[PDB]
Amino acid sequence: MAIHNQKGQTWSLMLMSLIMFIGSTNILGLLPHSFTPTTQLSMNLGMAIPLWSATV
Amino acid sequence: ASVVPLKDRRLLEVKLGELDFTPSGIAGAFQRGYYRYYNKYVNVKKGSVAGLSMVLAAYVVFNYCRSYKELKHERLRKYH
Amino acid sequence: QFQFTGIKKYFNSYTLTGRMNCVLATYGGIALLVLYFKLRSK
Amino acid sequence: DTSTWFITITSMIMTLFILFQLKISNYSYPASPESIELKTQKHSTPWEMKWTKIYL
Amino acid sequence: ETFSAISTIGVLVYIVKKYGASIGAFADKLNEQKIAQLEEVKQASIKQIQDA
Amino acid sequence: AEFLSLSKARIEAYEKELEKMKNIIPFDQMTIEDLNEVFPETKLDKKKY
């Protein structure tokens, strides 16, 4: 929140949902036989491009 | 069957750790959840281990079933 | 259907730029085709 | 491994961002609560002057 | 090949040590918030009842 | 005559302002909407910090 300080603060309530999902789905997989969805390269090319081109 | 699986999580969550019903989790059923490991995970008082570490112990043995077909390795006997 | 009006004030605010998955969708369709193309020529 | 073909996961990621925008949207904030701390005082403060003009 | 099953369960035992200090933090967390709520119920009554 | 009654309503509204403050919480863990009278809420994009 502190860096932006604009009327671009509306966007920041989403960016803390983005940190809890890949914060969790990278921490679940350390278990014995679990499976991480951020291992496959498919969804990460759907996490970058609909967010990166939402900026330009 | 939707009201059947939805009444599994709701009933289980209240019973396992925390919710005249909110302070029922203040004592907690963590004393009930405690006895499974040995004693050692004692820190469950306000960061509750036995509330969380049962789901993650369920998600491991659920994923042990899919892997079982691939890593067979067993002879015409039993192990040690 | 109340997974809408809790967040419906949010949607038409930022989905004007945020709901541009068309580029994502276009890329995905092309990706499926190339894989099929290489398995067609084996 | 080098997996292939991609028709999978990415359609099952945007259903997840209907969940995470439902949970995290109902979050109590100390800062937000703080901003409701001064709204009760100065209405009653000029209400003290509402009887000061009603008399004088 | 799952002797790394125990070592990912052995490290999660050492964090139960600091979890008995996480409780204090957890207990401390919102004490200010609940107190943060006790200040408004105390200020509003006493500032008005003398004014009346 | 007027100033003893214009202060009386200011005594009466202050007698109603505290009795509504006792209405909000019946317990420490009471409610998430009864505490939503004194401490405020607003429309979209009010709380800057």
From Swiss-Prot, chain A:
It is found in: Mitochondrion inner membrane. It comes from the Eukaryota. The chain crosses the membrane at residues 11-31, 40-56. Component of the ATP synthase complex composed at least of ATP5F1A/subunit alpha, ATP5F1B/subunit beta, ATP5MC1/subunit c (homooctomer), MT-ATP6/subunit a, MT-ATP8/subunit 8, ATP5ME/subunit e, ATP5MF/subunit f, ATP5MG/subunit g, ATP5MK/subunit k, ATP5MJ/subunit j, ATP5F1C/subunit gamma, ATP5F1D/subunit delta, ATP5F1E/subunit epsilon, ATP5PF/subunit F6, ATP5PB/subunit b, ATP5PD/subunit d, ATP5PO/subunit OSCP. Belongs to the ATPase A chain family. Subunit a, of the mitochondrial membrane ATP synthase complex (F(1)F(0) ATP synthase or Complex V) that produces ATP from ADP in the presence of a proton gradient across the membrane which is generated by electron transport complexes of the respiratory chain. ATP synthase complex consist of a soluble F(1) head domain - the catalytic core - and a membrane F(1) domain - the membrane proton channel. These two domains are linked by a central stalk rotating inside the F(1) region and a stationary peripheral stalk. This is ATP synthase F(0) complex subunit a. It comes from Sus scrofa (Pig). The gene is MT-ATP6. The chain holds residues 58 to 113 of 226 of the full protein.
UniProtKB/Swiss-Prot annotation, chain B:
Coiled coil: none annotated. Its main location: mitochondrion. This is ATP synthase F(0) complex subunit f, mitochondrial. Belongs to the ATPase F chain family. It holds the Pfam family WRW. Subunit f, of the mitochondrial membrane ATP synthase complex (F(1)F(0) ATP synthase or Complex V) that produces ATP from ADP in the presence of a proton gradient across the membrane which is generated by electron transport complexes of the respiratory chain. ATP synthase complex consist of a soluble F(1) head domain - the catalytic core - and a membrane F(1) domain - the membrane proton channel. These two domains are linked by a central stalk rotating inside the F(1) region and a stationary peripheral stalk. The modification N6-acetyllysine is found at K15. InterPro entries: F1F0-ATPsyn_F_prd (IPR019344). It is found in: Mitochondrion; Mitochondrion inner membrane. PANTHER family: ATP SYNTHASE F CHAIN, MITOCHONDRIAL-RELATED, ATP SYNTHASE SUBUNIT F, MITOCHONDRIAL. GO terms for biological process: ATP biosynthetic process; proton transmembrane transport. It comes from the Eukaryota. The lineage of its organism: Eukaryota, Metazoa, Chordata, Craniata, Vertebrata. One of its GO terms (cellular component) is mitochondrial inner membrane. Component of the ATP synthase complex composed at least of ATP5F1A/subunit alpha, ATP5F1B/subunit beta, ATP5MC1/subunit c (homooctomer), MT-ATP6/subunit a, MT-ATP8/subunit 8, ATP5ME/subunit e, ATP5MF/subunit f, ATP5MG/subunit g, ATP5MK/subunit k, ATP5MJ/subunit j, ATP5F1C/subunit gamma, ATP5F1D/subunit delta, ATP5F1E/subunit epsilon, ATP5PF/subunit F6, ATP5PB/subunit b, ATP5PD/subunit d, ATP5PO/subunit OSCP. It is a single-pass membrane protein. The modification Phosphoserine is found at S2. The chain crosses the membrane at residues 54-71. The modification N-acetylalanine is found at A1. Keywords: Acetylation, ATP synthesis, CF(0), Hydrogen ion transport, Ion transport, Membrane, Mitochondrion, Mitochondrion inner membrane, Phosphoprotein, Transmembrane, Transmembrane helix, Transport.
UniProtKB/Swiss-Prot annotation, chain D:
Keywords: Acetylation, ATP synthesis, CF(0), Hydrogen ion transport, Ion transport, Membrane, Mitochondrion, Transmembrane, Transmembrane helix, Transport. GO terms for molecular function: proton transmembrane transporter activity. Its main location: mitochondrion. One of its GO terms (cellular component) is proton-transporting ATP synthase complex. The modification N6-acetyllysine is found at K50, K53. It is found in: Mitochondrion membrane. GO terms for biological process: proton motive force-driven ATP synthesis. The chain crosses the membrane at residues 4-20. It is a single-pass membrane protein. The modification N6-succinyllysine is found at K50. Subunit 8, of the mitochondrial membrane ATP synthase complex (F(1)F(0) ATP synthase or Complex V) that produces ATP from ADP in the presence of a proton gradient across the membrane which is generated by electron transport complexes of the respiratory chain. ATP synthase complex consist of a soluble F(1) head domain - the catalytic core - and a membrane F(1) domain - the membrane proton channel. These two domains are linked by a central stalk rotating inside the F(1) region and a stationary peripheral stalk. Belongs to the ATPase protein 8 family. Component of the ATP synthase complex composed at least of ATP5F1A/subunit alpha, ATP5F1B/subunit beta, ATP5MC1/subunit c (homooctomer), MT-ATP6/subunit a, MT-ATP8/subunit 8, ATP5ME/subunit e, ATP5MF/subunit f, ATP5MG/subunit g, ATP5MK/subunit k, ATP5MJ/subunit j, ATP5F1C/subunit gamma, ATP5F1D/subunit delta, ATP5F1E/subunit epsilon, ATP5PF/subunit F6, ATP5PB/subunit b, ATP5PD/subunit d, ATP5PO/subunit OSCP. This is ATP synthase F(0) complex subunit 8. The lineage of its organism: Eukaryota, Metazoa, Chordata, Craniata, Vertebrata. The gene is MT-ATP8. The chain holds residues 5 to 60 of 67 of the full protein.
